[PDB]
Amino acid sequence: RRAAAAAAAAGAFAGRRAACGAVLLTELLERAAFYGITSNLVLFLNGAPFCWEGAQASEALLLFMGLTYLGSPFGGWLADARLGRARAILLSLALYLLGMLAFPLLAAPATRAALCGSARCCSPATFAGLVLVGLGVATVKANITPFGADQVKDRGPEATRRFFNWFYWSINLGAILSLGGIAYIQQNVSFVTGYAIPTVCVGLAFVVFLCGQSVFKVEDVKALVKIVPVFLALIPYWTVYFQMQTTYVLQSLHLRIPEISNPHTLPAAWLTMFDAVLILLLIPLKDKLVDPILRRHGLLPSSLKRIAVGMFFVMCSAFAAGILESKRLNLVKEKTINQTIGNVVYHAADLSLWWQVPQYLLIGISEIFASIAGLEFAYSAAPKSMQSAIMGLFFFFSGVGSFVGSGLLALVSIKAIGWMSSGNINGCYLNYYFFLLAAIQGATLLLFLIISVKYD
Ligand SMILES: *[C@@H]1O[C@H](CO)[C@@H](O)[C@H](O)[C@H]1NC(C)=O
């Protein structure tokens, strides 16, 4: 009946298989370039060409990340009022490539003198490149997601749900490619070759759109004022999610990591790969085991209950992380070993890294539910005219959540609490931090359930 009809719609893509693969490939390349920049920015800035202090490099990276969130609402407005989505994304990609071209030249010893030969050694060029890259990333992110779903929007609301699955899958594949290959070359072979590859990725991503150009009011005021509270209630979700991104890697550094060979010192960025490594293996499987199974039974059809399920699994992951951290802190009092990651030696307990697998499943399932469904809700529950501007607010509130999470981490590090009073974390109670994150996620779950019920 109706179910049969919806399953038939799931039979999507169909005619438009080109128009989509082009968007998927473009997003893959863009994410590869972004993760190539973000993974080893601090090591580049604190090295031989640049004598920046660690605090200066951290502030520079923080400003670069903050720009990519602040520019999203303005990038979306530019793509709706003055230009089209295609032209806006093309201009953003051109600016992104222009900012891209700066880093290889600085890395190259011959061309460094031309740019900044004669505190911060080369602040103007680096800041201009980072500003251009941030604006390009912010404009691409706020516009690629609604542009991609535009092709599959005719076949009902079931095709835009399947597209947002292979979009996230392509994002994570690009993350794996960038953090595995490019991040390896940037630290082992050379920075020139490690930064030339993402520039080539940006160049290829620009060609794909040029090749694929041939195949691509009170009510809305009410919609705006009705969807603003839902976005506001999602700030604690991002607050917890980014803190889990950071502290999970912090814990992984202090856990027994096996060696691969007999180029040395595997990059620390590889650890982040773990999370995305799950996501790939989940997204096809899930799709199948969710597209029939959860559709013919009429289970969990809305995009907000899926966010609630994602929050539940986030809380479960926080609790598992707290348990593992308590075990690690109990074990570390007996003996400790030293292992080198990059150019720094961490003191780690003799507890295997793979014991961290149960954590990354629970958040991974969360990113199966909360991450995709958030984009689906942002796309569907938005006025037709202001599409790609509501996504701007979505990605801006994500940045607000990230910054308030950084502030929360700074809060528990004061002398009064002392949870994070000190690269060694053997003297820091990360388990209490994980339990606090779990409590925050539970309160967010309850508040979001109330908000979702009121919204519907
Ligand atoms: C760990 O590092 C400390 C400081 O260098 C050193 O004294 C200790 O012997 C190291 N332990 C091992 C097993 O290398």
Numbering used by the authors: 18 to 135, 150 to 247, 311 to 356, 361 to 520, 525 to 558
Q: What did the publication describing this PDB structure actually write?
A:
TASL, a recently identified innate immune adaptor protein for endolysosomal TLR7/8/9 signaling, is recruited by the lysosomal proton-coupled amino-acid transporter SLC15A4, and then activates IRF5, which in turn triggers the transcription of type I interferons and cytokines. Solute carrier family 15 member 4 (SLC15A4, also known as PHT1) is one of four members of the SLC15 family, which belongs to the proton-coupled amino-acid/oligopeptide transporter (POT) family and the major facilitator superfamily (MFS). The architecture of SLC15A4 lacks a bulky soluble domain and the TM domain contains 12 TMs that mimic the canonical major facilitator superfamily (MFS) fold, with TM1 to TM6 forming the N-terminal bundle and TM7 to TM12 forming the C-terminal bundle. Here, we report three cryo-electron microscopy (cryo-EM) structures of human SLC15A4 in the apo monomeric and dimeric state and as a TASL-bound complex.
Given that the loop region between TM6 and TM7 of SLC15A4 was not visible in our structure and that a previous report showed that deleting the same loop does not affect the function the SLC15A4, we replaced a portion of this loop region of SLC15A4 (residues 253–303) with an ALFA tag in order to limit the movement of the bound ALFA_Nanobody. By coexpressing the ALFA tagged SLC15A4 and the ALFA nanobody in HEK293F cells followed by purification, we obtained the SLC15A4/ALFA_Nanobody complex for further cryo-EM structural analyses. Unlike other conventional nanobodies that have a larger binding interface, the ALFA_Nanobody bound to the short ALFA tag in the final complex is flexible and therefore the density of the ALFA nanobody in the final structure remains obscure. Nevertheless, the signal provided by the bound ALFA_Nanobody was very helpful for the 3D alignment of the particles, allowing us to finally resolve the structure of SLC15A4 in the monomeric state with a resolution of 3.25 Å. The monomeric SLC15A4 in the apo state also adopts an outward-facing conformation, exposed to the endolysosomal lumen, and a comparison with the dimerized structure shows that there are no essential differences between the two structures. The SLC15A4 in the outward-facing state possesses a solvent cleft towards the lysosomal lumen to bind possible substrates, whereas the cytosol side was sealed by the close packing of the cytosolic ends of TMs 1, 4, 5, 10, and 11. The narrow exit route was closed by several interaction networks between N- and C-bundle helices, including SLC15A4D181-R102, SLC15A4Q485-D181-Y477, and SLC15A4Y199-S469.
